[PDB]
Amino acid sequence: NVEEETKYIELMIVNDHLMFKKHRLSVVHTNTYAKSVVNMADLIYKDQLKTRIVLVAMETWATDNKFAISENPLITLREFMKYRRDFIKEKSDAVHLFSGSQFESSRSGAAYIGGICSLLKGGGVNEFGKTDLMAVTLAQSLAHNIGIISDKRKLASGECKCEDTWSGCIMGDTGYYLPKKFTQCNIEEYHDFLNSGGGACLFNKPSKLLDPPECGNGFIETGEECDCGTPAECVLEGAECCKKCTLTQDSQCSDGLCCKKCKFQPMGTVCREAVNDCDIRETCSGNSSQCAPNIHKMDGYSCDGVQGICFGGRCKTRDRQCKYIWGQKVTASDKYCYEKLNIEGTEKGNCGKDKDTWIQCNKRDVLCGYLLCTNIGNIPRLGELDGEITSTLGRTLNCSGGHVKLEEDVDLGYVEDGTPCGPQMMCLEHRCLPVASFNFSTCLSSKEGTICSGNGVCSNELKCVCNRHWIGSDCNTYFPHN
Amino acid sequence: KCPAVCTCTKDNALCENARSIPRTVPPDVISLSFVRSGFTEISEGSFLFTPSLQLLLFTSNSFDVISDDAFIGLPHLEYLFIENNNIKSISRHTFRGLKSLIHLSLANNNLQTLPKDIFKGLDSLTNVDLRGNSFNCDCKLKWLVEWLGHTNATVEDIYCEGPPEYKKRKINSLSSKDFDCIITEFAKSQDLPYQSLSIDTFSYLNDEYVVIAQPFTGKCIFLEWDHVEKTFRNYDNITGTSTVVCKPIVIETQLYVIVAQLFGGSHIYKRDSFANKFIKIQDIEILKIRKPNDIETFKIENNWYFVVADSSKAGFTTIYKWNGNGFYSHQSLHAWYRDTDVEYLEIVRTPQTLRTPHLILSSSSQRPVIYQWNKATQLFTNQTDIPNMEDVYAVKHFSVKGDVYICLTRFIGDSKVMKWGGSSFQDIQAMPSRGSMVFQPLQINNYQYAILGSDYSFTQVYNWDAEKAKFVKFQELNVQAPRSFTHVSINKRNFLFASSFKGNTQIYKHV
Ligand SMILES: *[C@@H]1O[C@H](CO)[C@@H](O)[C@H](O)[C@H]1NC(C)=O
Ligand SMILES: *[C@@H]1O[C@H](CO)[C@@H](O)[C@H](O)[C@H]1NC(C)=O
Ligand SMILES: *[C@@H]1O[C@H](CO)[C@@H](O)[C@H](O)[C@H]1NC(C)=O
Ligand SMILES: *[C@@H]1O[C@H](CO)[C@@H](O)[C@H](O)[C@H]1NC(C)=O
Ligand SMILES: *[C@@H]1O[C@H](CO)[C@@H](O)[C@H](O)[C@H]1NC(C)=O
Ligand SMILES: [Ca+2]
Ligand SMILES: [Ca+2]
Ligand SMILES: [Ca+2]
Ligand SMILES: [Ca+2]
Numbered sequence: 001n002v003e004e005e006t007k008y009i010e011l012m013i014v015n016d017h018l019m020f021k022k023h024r025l026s027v028v029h030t031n032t033y034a035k036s037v038v039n040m041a042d043l044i045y046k047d048q049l050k051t052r053i054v055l056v057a058m059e060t061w062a063t064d065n066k067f068a069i070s071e072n073p074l075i076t077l078r079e080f081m082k083y084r085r086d087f088i089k090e091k092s093d094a095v096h097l098f099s100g101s102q103f104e105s106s107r108s109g110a111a112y113i114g115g116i117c118s119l120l121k122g123g124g125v126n127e128f129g130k131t132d133l134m135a136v137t138l139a140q141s142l143a144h145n146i147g148i149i150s151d152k153r154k155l156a157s158g159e160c161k162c163e164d165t166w167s168g169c170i171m172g173d174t175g176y177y178l179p180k181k182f183t184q185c186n187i188e189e190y191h192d193f194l195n196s197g198g199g200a201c202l203f204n205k206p207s208k209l210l211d212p213p214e215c216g217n218g219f220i221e222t223g224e225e226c227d228c229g230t231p232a233e234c235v236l237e238g239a240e241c242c243k244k245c246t247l248t249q250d251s252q253c254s255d256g257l258c259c260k261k262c263k264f265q266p267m268g269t270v271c272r273e274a275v276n277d278c279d280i281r282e283t284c285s286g287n288s289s290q291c292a293p294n295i296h297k298m299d300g301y302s303c304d305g306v307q308g309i310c311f312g313g314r315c316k317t318r319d320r321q322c323k324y325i326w327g328q329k330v331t332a333s334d335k336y337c338y339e340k341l342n343i344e345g346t347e348k349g350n351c352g353k354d355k356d357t358w359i360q361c362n363k364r365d366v367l368c369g370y371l372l373c374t375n376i377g378n379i380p381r382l383g384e385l386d387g388e389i390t391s392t393l394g395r396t397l398n399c400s401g402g403h404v405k406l407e408e409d410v411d412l413g414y415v416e417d418g419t420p421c422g423p424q425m426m427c428l429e430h431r432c433l434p435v436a437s438f439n440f441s442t443c444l445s446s447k448e449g450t451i452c453s454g455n456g457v458c459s460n461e462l463k464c465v466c467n468r469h470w471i472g473s474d475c476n477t478y479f480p481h482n
Numbered sequence: 483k484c485p486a487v488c489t490c491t492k493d494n495a496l497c498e499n500a501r502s503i504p505r506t507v508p509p510d511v512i513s514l515s516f517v518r519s520g521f522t523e524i525s526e527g528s529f530l531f532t533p534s535l536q537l538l539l540f541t542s543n544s545f546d547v548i549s550d551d552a553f554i555g556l557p558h559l560e561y562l563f564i565e566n567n568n569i570k571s572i573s574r575h576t577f578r579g580l581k582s583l584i585h586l587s588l589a590n591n592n593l594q595t596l597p598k599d600i601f602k603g604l605d606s607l608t609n610v611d612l613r614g615n616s617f618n619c620d621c622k623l624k625w626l627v628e629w630l631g632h633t634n635a636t637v638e639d640i641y642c643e644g645p646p647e648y649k650k651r652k653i654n655s656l657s658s659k660d661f662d663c664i665i666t667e668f669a670k671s672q673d674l675p676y677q678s679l680s681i682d683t684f685s686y687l688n689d690e691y692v693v694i695a696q697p698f699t700g701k702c703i704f705l706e707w708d709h710v711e712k713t714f715r716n717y718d719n720i721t722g723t724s725t726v727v728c729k730p731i732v733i734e735t736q737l738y739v740i741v742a743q744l745f746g747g748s749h750i751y752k753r754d755s756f757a758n759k760f761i762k763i764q765d766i767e768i769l770k771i772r773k774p775n776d777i778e779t780f781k782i783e784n785n786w787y788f789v790v791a792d793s794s795k796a797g798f799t800t801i802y803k804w805n806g807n808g809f810y811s812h813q814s815l816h817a818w819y820r821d822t823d824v825e826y827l828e829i830v831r832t833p834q835t836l837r838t839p840h841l842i843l844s845s846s847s848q849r850p851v852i853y854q855w856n857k858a859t860q861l862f863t864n865q866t867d868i869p870n871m872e873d874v875y876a877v878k879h880f881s882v883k884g885d886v887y888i889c890l891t892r893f894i895g896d897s898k899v900m901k902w903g904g905s906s907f908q909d910i911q912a913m914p915s916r917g918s919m920v921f922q923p924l925q926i927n928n929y930q931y932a933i934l935g936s937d938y939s940f941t942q943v944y945n946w947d948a949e950k951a952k953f954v955k956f957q958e959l960n961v962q963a964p965r966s967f968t969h970v971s972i973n974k975r976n977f978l979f980a981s982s983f984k985g986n987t988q989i990y991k992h993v
Contacts, residue, residue, distance in 0.1 A: 022847075071818070102847070104818040106796035128847055130873075130893075165724070165745075166698055175744060175773040175793050176822070 002275050003191040005257070005291075007051035007202040009116070009142060010093035011038065014080070015060040016069060018100030022128060030060050033131070034098055035210070040135035041142070044170070048182050049190055052218075053142065054206045057090045071104035074407055077111070077125045084123055093201045094145055095123040096138065103127050108137045108174060111144035113382065113406070114193065117201035118312065121145075136178050140170050147193025148186050149382045153327050156379055160185030197278045197313035200460070203294035205256075215245040226254035253289035264289065277303045278310035280457060280465050295459045299418075300440045309420050313460070316418045322373040325380050325404055325412055333372035337399035341392055342369035348390045349401065351430040352414065359430075368415045368427030376400040383412060446476040484508065503528045512558075515539035522546040530555040537561040544568040550575035560584040560606075567591050574599060582606050590614035594644075598625040607635040616643040619651060621663040627656045646949065666929070668943065668957050668978055671989040672713070676703075678981040681968045684730040686737045686753070690972050691717060692979065693728045693739070694987065702728040702741060707972055714989070720751060720760055729777040733786055733804060740788055740809075742774035748790070750809060764808045766790075772797035776876070780826040782839050782855065787812065789841065791821040799824065799843060801862070813861045815853065820846040823876035827852075829886055832904030842868075842877045842888070850874045850890070868907055871898065880923035882930055882946060889932060891921040897934060899953060911952050913942070919983075922967040926976050926992050931956070935964035941980070961988050 013034050023029035035055060042053040066083050070076045080097045088095060094116050103109075111124030124141035126134060143149075150171040154160040160183055162169035168179045171186060193199060206219065213221035218229040224245035228238030241247070241262035242254040251262035257272070258265040265271070267286035272294060274281045278301060282292040296313040303310050308317035319332040341349030345360025351369040352359045361369040370390075378389060383406040392399040404412035414430065415421075421432040428437060443458035445451060452464035456475035459465050466475035484490035485504040488497040494513045497504065501520035509532055516539065523546050529535060535556050540563070550573045553559065559580055565587050574597045577583070583604050588596075593615040601607070610633075617623055619642035630637060630653065642648040647662070674694075682693040692705035692714065702720035720728070724744035731738045737753035739760065748771055750764035773794035780787055786804035799821045802809035815821075827840035831854070839855035841862050850871055853862035868874075868890075876891045888907065890898040897915045900907035915921075917937030924931045930946035932953050941964050944953035962985025970977035978990035 102818065102820075103795070106794070108795070130846065133846070173773065173794060176775055 002194045002272065003050075005050075005203065005272070006205075007049070007194075007199065008093075008205055009045070009051060009053045009146070009202060010056045010091070010204070010206060011053055011142075012057035012088070012090060012092035012095045013038065013055065013098055014088075014095065015058070015098045016100060017061045017063070017065045018069070019098050019128060020060055020062055020100070022100040025062070027060060027062065031058065034058065036131050037098075037134045037138060040132060041138040044135065044139050044180070045142070048187065049146070051146070051202070052206075053138075054219075055210050056092055056206060058210070069099060069101055071101075073103045073105050073107065073110040073125055073127075076103070077123075080125055081120055081123050085119060093117060093122065094142065096141060097123070097125040098128070098134075099125060100128045106173075108133075109141045111141040113144050113149055114147050114198055114314070115145040116147075116199055132178055133174070136170060136174055140174075143171060143182075143186070146190060147196075147198055148182070148189050151185060151189065151381050153377065153379050153381045154185060195275050197276045197296060197310075197315065200279075200294045200296055200313045203272070203291065205290050228254055256289035257291040258284035258286075259289040276313075276315065278313050278315055280459055295461055295465075298440070298443075298458045298460050298462065300435065300438075301458075302420075306423075307420065309418060309426060311418045316416055316420075318367075318371065318415060318419060321371060321412075321416050321419070322376075325371075325382070326373055326376050326402070327381060330376055331374045333374050333399050334397045335367070337372045337392070337397050338366050338369065341372065341399055342366045348392050349399070361430075365421070365427075365430065365432045367421035368419070368430050368432050370401050371413050371415050372399045372401050374398055374400060376402065380404045380412075382406065386411075444474045446474040505531050507532050510534060513537040513539075515541070517542050519543045524548045524552045526551040527554055528552055533557075535559050537563075539563045539565075541566045545570065547571045547573070548576050549573055551578055552576055554579040556580065558582060563587045564591065565589045565611075569593065572600070573597065576600065577604060578602075580604055585609040585611075587611035588615070592616045594618050595622050596626055598622075601629060601633075607633070610635050610637045612640045613638050615640065617653060618642070618644045619648040619653060619656065619661075620645065621661055623653070624658060624661050627653060627660075628658060630654050646947075666993060668959065668990040669993055671977060671991045673986045673988050675986055677983060677985070678703075678987040679725075679965050679983065680727045681966050681979045681981050681987070682728060682730055683968055683970050683979075684732055684737070686732060687735065687755075690970065691730075692968075692970060693730055694981070695725045695728045697725060697983075700725060702739065709973075718760065722746070722749065726774055727777040729779055729788060731779050731786060731788065731804075740777055740790075742771075742777055742790060744773060747771075748774060770797065770800060770811070770814075775821070776823040778824040778826050780839070783857075789824045789826075791824045791843070793820045793822055793846070795820065815841070815862065816843050816845065816851065819843070819848065822846060825877040825879060825888075827879055827886070827888075829902055830904070837886075844874045844876050847873055850877055868900075870909070875919065876921070878921065878923055880925065880930060880932075887923075889921040889923050891915070891918055893918060897921050899932075913944075913953075920964050920966060924967060924969045924978070926969055926971075933959070933964075933967045935961070935967070937963045937983075959988075959990070961985065 015030050020030055023033055038053055038055045045051045045053050067079045084095050109124060109126040112121040115121035124145060126137045126141055151160055162183055164181060167177050169181055169183050170179045208221050209219060213223055215224055216230055218227055220227045225247045226242040227245055228234035228242045238255040241251045252264045253259040264286055265284040269284040270281060271284050271291035272282040279296040285292060297310050299311050301310040303315035304317055308315040322330050322332045342361040345358050349370040350358035351361035383404045386403045386405045390401040402413050415427050417428055419427045421427050424435045425432050441462050443452050443462060443464050445453055447453040451458050453474050453476040455470045456464040456466040464475045469479055471477050471479045485506050487500045488495050495507050495511045496515045498517045499520060500516060503521060511532055512534055514535055526549050533555055536558055545567060560582055562583060569591050584606055589611040595618055640653050642651040642653055677698060678694045679697045680695045684691055690707050694703040696703055700721055700723045702725055704717040705714040706717035708715055722741050722743045723746050725741055726744060727742040729740045739751040742748050747768035748766040749762055751760045752763045754761055771790055771792055773792055774790050775793040776791040778789050787801055789801045791799050795818050798814040799816050800811055801813040803812040821843050823844045825842040828837035829840050830837050841853040843851045850868040852866045854864040856863050871890055874890050875893060877888050879888045886902040888900050892915045895915055896912045897918060898912050899910045901910050913934055916939045918935055920935035922933050932944035934942045941959040941961050943957045943959060945956040947954045961980045961982050963983035965981040965983050968979045970979060976992035978992060980988045
């Protein structure tokens with residue numbers, strides 16, 4: 001499935017000016033030092049999350065800083081991602097900043113949750129430290145991106161605990177004695193995130209690294225035709241196929257989901273099933289040993305009936321957002337709860353806060369206001385609770401809400417942008433706007449009123465995925481083939 | 483016929499680059515010389531095929547061993563010149579059977595010793611040359627001093643090249659009186675079957691106790707001295723889930739223990755003389771102190787304090803003050819820093835003449851900081867960095883000849899020793915740190931020691947050299963991942979406790 005596959009984090013490292021000064025203005029020292037950090041973070045990820053951290057790109061600010069580094073990591077993070085948006089043009093699953101400075105917060109770094117594969121959220125920031133220490137810093141930073149958050153609800157309840165009494169666990173507060181392991185709860189969160197449609201860009205396996213070719217690395221580099229892994233694990237897959245990084249007499253490939261006993265899997269074979277109604281299944285090309293790059297439906301497709309709309313392969317519903325913040329047992333409130341409280345614009349329901357005063361929601365922009373849930377608890381799964389939890393009461397409906405702050409600017413407890421508020425309408429900055437307001441791109445279509453000639457689905461790469469027996473970039477040509 | 487490696491006349495043979503002592507030297511030769519030879523050993527009876535030798539010369543060779551009876555079977559040998567060679571070992575009976583020997587030279591071989599009775603039975607000796615060697619003047623050389631005093635043979639003045647207190651001393655001028663044969667060492671007392679992080683000692687009601695922090699179990703293990711069985715028993719225990727430090731404070735005969743924990747928070751315990759137990763009387767808040775790593779105690783003008791280094795960011799290094807009933811916050815230092823260790827110092831600031839209280843903080847990827855005590859505001863200020871030092875783990879101070887020094891510890895790279903000179907610290911020496919976590923100075927019986935721990939290799943013990951004004955290699959210990967070294971003094975008996983992070987904590991005896 002999607003959790004038994006080996007994942008790959010295509011990572012880019014940016015070294016700021018202070019990091020450059022720490023290694024005595026040396027480019028080669030900065031590179032090897034960062035590679036050490038990445039490699040050790042990789043060895044952590046490889047063992048437990050079944051995921052590789054592969055360095056694919058790097059640059060170092062040798063002259064001076066591109067922007068002002070803040071003692072606040074969250075402030076620094078945002079300015080870095082702005083730099084990433086406007087100045088970084090190399091491709092990566094995530095871009096992380098290595099700062100030579102030291103932050104004035106409780107954490108040694110900061111990173112957006114569920115951020116990977118994104119241009120604005122796909123990154124994190126990490127402060128300087130010893131090689132082993134910064135590796136842990138990168139691990140917990142990439143953890144947030146990869147969807148791993150220390151569920152405070154299960155932590156407080158005792159549902160999830162670190163069994164390591166001494167070294168502790170990665171998502172915990174770091175001291176001199178460094179952690180080495182994720183909790184089982186962290187693993188499930190990671191599995192849930194992938195099953196939720198996240199981490200789509202993580203299934204492309206890198207080939208040529210930034211280092212000299214190494215036979216027995218699990219990567220097909222320059223000169224070598226294949227690379228099974230380690231001689232121990234090569235026995236499982238690739239033993240008969242690959243000998244000293246060279247294809248045998250009767251072999252087209254070595255290992256992979258589309259490789260069967262040193263031979264290619266025929267075209268049309270399912271190698272990765274859709275994890276949800278936002279995803280597109282992947283079939284073997286027949287010409288490659290690896291399964292096709294994990295793609296999904298573009299932003300705009302509906303999910304959970306008409307209750308949700310796909311964004312980055314994930315379904316944005318008020319129901320899921322409530323489960324995301326307060327727990328799986330929590331469900332979204334009835335629409336009647338919104339239709340009454342949000343219009344008031346009180347503390348118990350509103351469309352935002354403007355200078356000590358709440359905004360009274362409009363009657364159309366009611367589904368884009370204060371988030372309302374049922375059977376709520378008293379501790380969010382993530383972030384900090386700012387204030388108290390709102391609880392409002394033929395049927396009588398219990399409307400519950402709450403202000404959860406990840407950032408000083410970002411407030412969970414309001415309807416997330418992109419959440420449906422009606423037929424072909426979504427929420428944007430606490431306002432119910434039509435689909436045209438989001439300026440979604442479109443695939444090629446040779447039939448009016450249909451997506452991909454009504455014979456295909458528009459992928460997130462803006463390409464048409466044709467149904468069975470249909471071909472062409474517009475999926476209009478019919479192709480009969482047993 | 484003459485061997486190929488040799489040049490021969492009727493009476494003489496000169497051999498060069500010989501790979502072994504040739505057995506084919508013409509048996510009528512009376513003088514034989516070996517120069518720049520290949521062979522490394524001279525075994526017994528090596529010259530029996532040339533029984534009429536009167537003279538033998540060895541020069542510019544390298545020997546592993548010259549064995550017993552190497553020169554046996556040579557009753558006419560009157561001259562034996564062994565000079566300008568490298569010689570690893572000479573044996574007691576090397577010259578046995580050389581009753582006719584008139585002149586023996588062992589000059590310029592850089593010999594460090596000679597075995598007792600090496601010259602026994604050499605009754606014809608008129609001359610012995612011993613110059614140009616490197617004799618160590620210790621107990622093993624005692625026989626030579628006596629021999630020099632009694633021999634009729636002519637022997638030139640020769641000099642000790644060691645030990646340092648004997649260097650350039652004329653050996654001919656030594657007596658049996660002068661041998662320093664006694665000397666100290668850290669001998670292994672016992673190995674306690676458990677792991678430990680920090681070890682502390684104190685005096686309670688005129689008995690000496692030892693506190694051991696057990697990280698993995700949770701225990702603060704108190705040890706007590708048995709004056710009849712001459713060992714350490716298990717006095718009492720203190721439970722705390724993740725203890726890092728167990729610092730004892732004795733205020734007016736009452737014992738207090740600060741227990742730093744990584745989990746559940748830190749607490750303060752008080753020993754009860756009546757109930758014969760430890761009581762938990764105070765709780766340090768978990769939010770101000772989160773990741774403690776070191777506790778130090780000190781006294782400034784009849785006021786008691788202690789400082790807790792917090793290796794976390796949100797947790798600030800905080801000073802507490804004794805106010806008769808308990809300890810309370812006095813001052814926070816180094817906000818947002820990952821402070822690893824604290825050290826209390828009493829140092830003279832130029833041009834003052836009196837020592838004033840100082841604090842030193844070590845933090846990750848940062849320079850050590852020196853705080854100065856301000857009597858007016860009753861808090862430490864005026865911080866200054868220690869230059870030349872990046873990523874220092876811990877600092878510890880000692881005093882010799884009134885001057886104040888410190889020991890700077892690194893994990894990798896090189897540890898440093900510095901002297902205080904009025905305004906700042908100055909470089910004295912440096913030592914390679916192979917996974918070092920400790921560089922603890924200790925003063926035992928007015929001897930200044932310095933123990934540099936190592937996780938990768940052996941723990942090195944240093945001694946202070948008065949002539950060199952520096953630490954020198956002394957004894958080499960073997961402990962798994964040492965975390966601390968503490969000196970325990972009980973009734974003229976000096977013990978050395980060595981904490982082990984993965985192996986067994988070890989107790990040493992100083993004799
Ligand atoms: C692999 O794909 C290329 C097109 O990208 C095609 O030209 C080639 O023939 C294919 N190889 C095989 C063995 O089918
Ligand atoms: C869509 O609208 C936003 C503002 O509403 C604008 O910034 C963006 O450029 C538009 N997209 C396109 C493709 O024009
Ligand atoms: C050395 O002199 C002493 C005089 O006391 C004499 O008895 C002894 O025989 C002499 N021995 C040698 C080897 O010269
Ligand atoms: C203290 O020692 C006793 C026996 O010596 C042992 O049974 C007990 O578990 C120990 N407790 C702690 C906290 O060290
Ligand atoms: C130290 O404190 C004194 C207070 O008299 C002040 O004049 C001086 O500037 C301070 N120096 C530093 C480095 O803080
Ligand atoms: Ca990728
Ligand atoms: Ca390879
Ligand atoms: Ca897919
Ligand atoms: Ca200390």
